[PDB]
Coordinates of all heavy atoms in Angstrom, one line a residue:
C24 N -51.4 -43.3 113.9 CA -50.8 -42.2 114.7 C -51.9 -41.8 115.7 O -53.0 -41.6 115.3 CB -50.4 -41.0 113.9 SG -49.6 -39.7 114.8
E25 N -51.6 -41.8 117.0 CA -52.6 -41.5 118.1 C -52.9 -40.0 118.1 O -54.0 -39.7 118.6 CB -52.1 -42.0 119.4 CG -51.8 -43.5 119.5 CD -53.1 -44.4 119.4 OE1 -54.2 -43.9 119.4 OE2 -52.9 -45.7 119.4
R26 N -52.0 -39.2 117.6 CA -52.2 -37.8 117.5 C -53.1 -37.5 116.3 O -54.2 -36.9 116.5 CB -50.8 -37.1 117.4 CG -50.9 -35.5 117.5 CD -49.6 -34.9 117.9 NE -49.7 -33.5 118.0 CZ -49.2 -32.6 117.1 NH1 -48.8 -33.0 115.9 NH2 -49.1 -31.3 117.4
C27 N -52.7 -37.8 115.1 CA -53.4 -37.4 113.9 C -54.1 -38.4 113.0 O -54.7 -38.1 112.0 CB -52.4 -36.6 113.0 SG -51.3 -37.7 112.0
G28 N -53.9 -39.7 113.4 CA -54.6 -40.8 112.7 C -54.0 -41.2 111.4 O -54.7 -41.9 110.6
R29 N -52.8 -40.9 111.1 CA -52.1 -41.3 109.9 C -51.8 -42.8 109.9 O -51.2 -43.2 110.9 CB -50.8 -40.5 109.7 CG -50.1 -40.6 108.4 CD -48.9 -39.7 108.2 NE -48.7 -39.5 106.8 CZ -47.8 -40.1 106.1 NH1 -47.2 -41.2 106.5 NH2 -47.5 -39.7 104.8
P30 N -52.2 -43.6 108.9 CA -51.9 -45.0 108.9 C -50.4 -45.4 108.6 O -49.9 -46.4 109.2 CB -52.8 -45.6 107.8 CG -53.0 -44.4 106.9 CD -52.9 -43.1 107.7
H31 N -49.7 -44.7 107.7 CA -48.4 -45.0 107.3 C -47.3 -44.4 108.2 O -47.6 -43.3 108.8 CB -48.1 -44.5 105.9 CG -48.5 -45.5 104.8 ND1 -48.0 -46.7 104.7 CD2 -49.4 -45.4 103.8 CE1 -48.5 -47.4 103.7 NE2 -49.4 -46.6 103.1
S32 N -46.2 -45.0 108.4 CA -45.0 -44.5 109.0 C -45.2 -44.2 110.5 O -44.6 -43.3 111.0 CB -44.4 -43.4 108.3 OG -44.0 -43.8 107.0
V33 N -46.0 -45.1 111.2 CA -46.2 -44.9 112.6 C -45.2 -45.7 113.4 O -45.1 -46.9 113.2 CB -47.6 -45.4 113.0 CG1 -48.0 -45.1 114.4 CG2 -48.7 -44.8 112.1
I34 N -44.4 -45.1 114.2 CA -43.3 -45.7 115.0 C -43.9 -46.2 116.3 O -44.7 -45.5 116.9 CB -42.2 -44.7 115.2 CG1 -41.7 -44.0 113.9 CG2 -41.0 -45.4 115.9 CD1 -40.9 -42.8 114.1
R35 N -43.6 -47.4 116.7 CA -44.2 -48.1 117.8 C -43.8 -47.6 119.2 O -44.6 -47.6 120.1 CB -43.9 -49.6 117.8 CG -44.5 -50.4 116.6 CD -44.0 -51.8 116.7 NE -44.8 -52.7 115.8 CZ -44.5 -54.0 115.7 NH1 -43.5 -54.6 116.3 NH2 -45.3 -54.7 114.8
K36 N -42.5 -47.2 119.3 CA -41.9 -46.6 120.5 C -42.8 -45.4 121.0 O -43.1 -45.3 122.1 CB -40.5 -46.1 120.3 CG -39.7 -45.6 121.5 CD -39.4 -46.7 122.4 CE -38.3 -46.3 123.4 NZ -38.8 -45.4 124.5
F37 N -43.1 -44.5 120.0 CA -43.8 -43.3 120.3 C -45.3 -43.4 120.0 O -46.0 -42.5 120.5 CB -43.1 -42.2 119.5 CG -41.6 -42.2 119.7 CD1 -40.8 -42.6 118.6 CD2 -41.1 -41.9 120.9 CE1 -39.4 -42.6 118.8 CE2 -39.7 -42.0 121.1 CZ -38.9 -42.4 120.1
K38 N -45.8 -44.4 119.2 CA -47.1 -44.4 118.7 C -47.5 -43.1 117.9 O -48.6 -42.7 117.9 CB -48.1 -44.8 119.7 CG -48.1 -46.2 120.2 CD -49.2 -46.6 121.1 CE -49.0 -48.0 121.8 NZ -50.2 -48.3 122.7
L39 N -46.5 -42.6 117.2 CA -46.7 -41.3 116.4 C -46.2 -41.6 115.0 O -45.3 -42.3 114.8 CB -45.9 -40.2 117.0 CG -46.4 -39.7 118.4 CD1 -45.3 -38.7 118.9 CD2 -47.7 -39.0 118.3
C40 N -46.9 -40.9 114.0 CA -46.3 -40.9 112.7 C -45.0 -40.1 112.6 O -44.7 -39.4 113.6 CB -47.3 -40.2 111.7 SG -47.5 -38.4 111.8
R41 N -44.4 -40.2 111.5 CA -43.1 -39.5 111.2 C -43.3 -37.9 111.3 O -42.3 -37.3 111.7 CB -42.5 -39.9 109.9 CG -43.4 -39.5 108.7 CD -42.6 -40.0 107.5 NE -43.4 -39.8 106.2 CZ -43.6 -38.6 105.7 NH1 -43.1 -37.5 106.2 NH2 -44.3 -38.6 104.6
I42 N -44.4 -37.4 110.9 CA -44.7 -36.0 110.9 C -44.8 -35.5 112.3 O -44.1 -34.6 112.7 CB -45.8 -35.6 110.0 CG1 -45.6 -36.2 108.5 CG2 -46.1 -34.1 109.9 CD1 -46.7 -35.8 107.5
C43 N -45.8 -36.0 113.0 CA -46.0 -35.7 114.4 C -44.8 -35.9 115.3 O -44.5 -35.0 116.2 CB -47.2 -36.4 115.0 SG -48.8 -36.1 114.3
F44 N -44.0 -36.9 115.1 CA -42.8 -37.2 115.8 C -41.8 -36.1 115.7 O -41.2 -35.7 116.7 CB -42.2 -38.5 115.4 CG -40.8 -38.8 116.0 CD1 -40.6 -39.2 117.3 CD2 -39.7 -38.6 115.2 CE1 -39.4 -39.5 117.8 CE2 -38.4 -38.8 115.7 CZ -38.3 -39.3 117.0
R45 N -41.6 -35.6 114.4 CA -40.7 -34.5 114.1 C -41.1 -33.3 114.9 O -40.2 -32.7 115.6 CB -40.7 -34.2 112.6 CG -39.6 -33.3 112.2 CD -39.8 -33.0 110.7 NE -38.6 -32.2 110.3 CZ -38.7 -31.0 109.6 NH1 -39.8 -30.7 109.0 NH2 -37.6 -30.3 109.4
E46 N -42.3 -32.9 114.8 CA -42.8 -31.7 115.4 C -42.7 -31.6 116.9 O -42.1 -30.7 117.5 CB -44.3 -31.5 115.1 CG -44.6 -31.2 113.6 CD -46.1 -31.1 113.2 OE1 -46.9 -31.2 114.1 OE2 -46.3 -31.0 112.0
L47 N -43.1 -32.7 117.6 CA -43.1 -32.8 119.1 C -41.6 -33.0 119.6 O -41.3 -32.5 120.7 CB -44.0 -34.0 119.5 CG -45.5 -33.8 119.2 CD1 -46.2 -35.0 119.8 CD2 -46.0 -32.6 119.8
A48 N -40.8 -33.7 118.8 CA -39.4 -33.8 119.1 C -38.7 -32.4 119.2 O -37.9 -32.2 120.1 CB -38.7 -34.7 118.1

């Protein structure tokens, strides 16, 4: 994750983890 550096569950469209994606969405 480019935001928080999480290795798991990083989505390629957003380059964000599932946690960061939820928050910013």
